[PDB]
Design a protein around this ligand. Sequence first.
Ligand SMILES: COc1ncc(-c2cc(NC(=O)CN3CCOCC3)c3cocc3c2)cc1NS(C)(=O)=O
Length: 858
Amino acid sequence: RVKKLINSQISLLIGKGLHEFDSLRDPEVNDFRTKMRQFCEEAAAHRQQLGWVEWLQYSFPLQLEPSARGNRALLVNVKFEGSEESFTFQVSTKDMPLALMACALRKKATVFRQPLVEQPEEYALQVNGRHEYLYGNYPLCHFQYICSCLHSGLTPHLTMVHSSSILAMRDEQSNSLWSLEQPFSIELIEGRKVNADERMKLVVQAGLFHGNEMLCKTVSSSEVNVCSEPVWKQRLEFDISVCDLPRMARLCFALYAVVDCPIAWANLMLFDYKDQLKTGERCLYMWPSVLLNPAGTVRGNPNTESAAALVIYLPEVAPHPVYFPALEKILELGRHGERGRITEEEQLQLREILERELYEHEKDLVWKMRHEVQEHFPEALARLLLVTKWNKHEDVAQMLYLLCSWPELPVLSALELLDFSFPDCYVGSFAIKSLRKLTDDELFQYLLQLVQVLKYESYLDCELTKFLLGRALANRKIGHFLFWHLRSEMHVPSVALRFGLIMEAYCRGSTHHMKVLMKQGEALSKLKALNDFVKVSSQKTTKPQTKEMMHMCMRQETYMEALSHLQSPLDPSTLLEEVCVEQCTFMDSKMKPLWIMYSSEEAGSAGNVGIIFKNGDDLRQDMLTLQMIQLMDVLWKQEGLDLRMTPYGCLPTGDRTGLIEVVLHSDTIANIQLNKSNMAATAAFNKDALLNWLKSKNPGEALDRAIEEFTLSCAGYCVATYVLGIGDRHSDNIMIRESGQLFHIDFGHFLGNERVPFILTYDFVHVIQQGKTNNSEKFERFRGYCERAYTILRRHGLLFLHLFALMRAAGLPELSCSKDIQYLKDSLALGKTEEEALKHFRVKFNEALRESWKTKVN
Ligand SMILES: COc1ncc(-c2cc(NC(=O)CN3CCOCC3)c3cocc3c2)cc1NS(C)(=O)=O
């Protein structure tokens, strides 16, 4: 009776009725659902018997300063849970939270006149009106909240939570092949539901691929006239023996009418998930094209009513079922071989090509010397896997014998092995095995990417699915973001199945979070409906009248209930409590996004947050551009360079639907540039507007930090926008914070999509120099910041180049081919030495400085 209640709720949350999974009557889906439910059930169980501190590490994972993960006078306002009274203590930034708790329980004792039994080990420090906690043995300054407070000059507000209270929340949440030498062949029987120009003839181009690389030369079909139902019944004979086919082998098809014009495409794995070599008739429900597309999904098109079907016949090779040899048989064959016996002369050449694409003889050198490659250069695994001939059974057995006994690579090297260039499942398992060491902070930084690698998966049940699920159930934030990255792509038919199953499994592992995300979903349902009125009304009537019948609408009992008392999809630590209906408006852009305001009694001024709801644009590129800027900011802070960046939240939630974080107390450059009369910023020259503006937002001595806050953020934004190749930078998409902090918004076109140069703007160069015309001292400190930020970004170029490589799986039209990844392999300048790249960056900056001189002349 509780089950059907849970199952109706899962289906509603994922926006796909679980009956549809059963309807397919697919044994691969039916096994994932049983196998993965069990895993998640085991997880939930282990989680319900966690310690009170351990539970904190789940529900509220520590938010630490990049500098700290891996002295100064500070006033702090601590209170106790069931209390109205509070205390202000003058702690230090070097103090552990415990000394504060010890301080708080001493003050409580004296006030309440009682010799207190309580110890500070029994307590935790909640951030007031937040799902943020201050625990462990880390100085206060190490905590992101405490640190933000010092910069903003604000007083940290903490509530003392007893172990009993945490436990009370913990509780309230309890739920043989190698013999077959014949050349692999197929029968292209017929086609169905095809549409093409009568004047042409149809062709089927089939090819055998292992990731991207061809396993052999592709074979085309006979030219058969344009018919909705064309018939071939021909034998497509491929130049590859049945034994030689690898385990992760995929057969790709291309249907195209020629006089070139592609109709559709469809791929499939020759081996089933249970390692059986597929035999019988197969009807490939193709996907529309825009000649082979390996990377494309191996499971058929769901809408079978429009889709052009291709019926093929996998012939019976042996008299009984053939299963891919087990590792036992694989390691036996690859054990024996001739070891790499070569001259120190050719060993020198080997170190060169490994430390440094490569020539044919060079590959042969990497393959003959594979044992040395494992012994003295293990990080060079990927390059060795690329010299391997996956179209010969014995070379693969040789490779997998070296991998099985290969040392665990670092996290940076394991990210390369997730890419489609390495489709071997034992290589991927090893990749995840080398990735397991990932810190929960690190994992979260690369989760967007590892979730995109799920689209490169051949089979439903895989290491990556199990690893992400197990990690998501071990950290409520990872679980929050995992769900939303999955949920947002349910409209896409090529993933709706996989994703739905992943999310259904997750729900079995966290019944309570399933209720929390359903609460969030129900709010976004109302916002989609509200935005629809706004889109319509903004056309007919004026903004004051739309802004009013939108409030009236939000005032309704359904709206008031759904839009209030929830966690933010933008950050689950953020508790969007009571909605400020009067403070709610909508931007005047094409889509008419919504500005939703929130406020809290508990959180206080730190609880007055805002969100932006947008329906109409694809939000996946901005999300990527902002994760990159945030990573840039993490990589800089790690080297002690804090360029005071603002990577505000962005999160796609559904079909062309998402949320953007309101950065309160910020305004677009342009708005200030308007130089309106009767204001506190009204200038005699347009050059002054920003400076005069900062003056008013930063009186007296406060101006000097604001200018410096401006300089750093500007250094970082120039450097963030150069590397990423962010174009279309007008006055609108640049915003300034009252603190002086500068930031960018609306990331329409990155990776030069032609070739975006270094950008410098005299209106900000006038602010940097503190109003002065010639101020080489202050300006050249800004040039120094740019150089520092640029060189730190280059030293992590393989990290950006690996996260952009994997991100190709999303299908962002400004990130799909080789040239897009060349952009970073040109901006981060990884061919040139640090000195040769620094030479070229200064030459790029000076050119921008000269370009900025178009205004200094006028
Ligand atoms: C991806 O699109 C966007 N990317 C970013 C933002 C965005 C916008 C902000 N603020 C405003 O637009 C304030 N306005 C209100 C109306 O008068 C002018 C000033 C933000 C402040 O903190 C983070 C912000 C992020 C918006 C869009 N969508 S749009 C450009 O079509 O409205």
